[PDB]
Amino acid sequence: KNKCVNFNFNGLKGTGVLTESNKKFLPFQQFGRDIADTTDAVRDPQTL
Amino acid sequence: QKLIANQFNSAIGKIQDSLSSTPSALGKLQDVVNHNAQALNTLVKQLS
Numbered sequence: 001k002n003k004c005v006n007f008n009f010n011g012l013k014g015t016g017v018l019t020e021s022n023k024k025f026l027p028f029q030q031f032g033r034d035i036a037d038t039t040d041a042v043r044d045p046q047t048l
Numbered sequence: 049q050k051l052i053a054n055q056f057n058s059a060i061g062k063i064q065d066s067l068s069s070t071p072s073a074l075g076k077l078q079d080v081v082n083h084n085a086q087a088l089n090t091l092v093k094q095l096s
C-alpha cells in the first residue's frame with residue numbers, strides 16, 4: 001500500500017497507489033466509481 | 049447642470065437595480081463557462 005503497486009482485485013486489474021478511504025460503501029457494494037466512470041474505490045475481498 | 053446631475057444619478061441607480069434584478073442579463077458571459085466546463089465533461093466521458 002502507499003506505493004505504485006499493480007492490483008488485481010477479483011479479476012479487476014489496475015495500477016495506482018492504494019490508500020485508506022473514508023467512503024462508506026453499502027453492504028453489497030464492491031467497486032467504487034468517480035465522476036469519470038473509472039474505478040476509484042475498491043473493497044478488499046479478504047477484509048471488509 | 050443640477051437637472052443633468054440628478055438624471056445621471058437616477059440612471060446609475062436604475063442600472064444598479066436592473067443588474068441586481070435580471071439574472072439572464074449576464075448570459076453572454078455565463079454561457080462561456082457553461083460551454084467550456086461541459087466540453088471537458090464530454091471528453092472525460094470518452095474514457096467510458
Ligand SMILES: *[C@@H]1O[C@H](CO)[C@@H](O)[C@H](O)[C@H]1NC(C)=O
Pocket residue numbers: 045046047
Ligand atoms: C477470510 O479469512 C480471514 C482470516 O483467514 C478473516 O479475517 C476474514 O474475515 C475472512 N473473510 C470473510 C469474508 O469472512
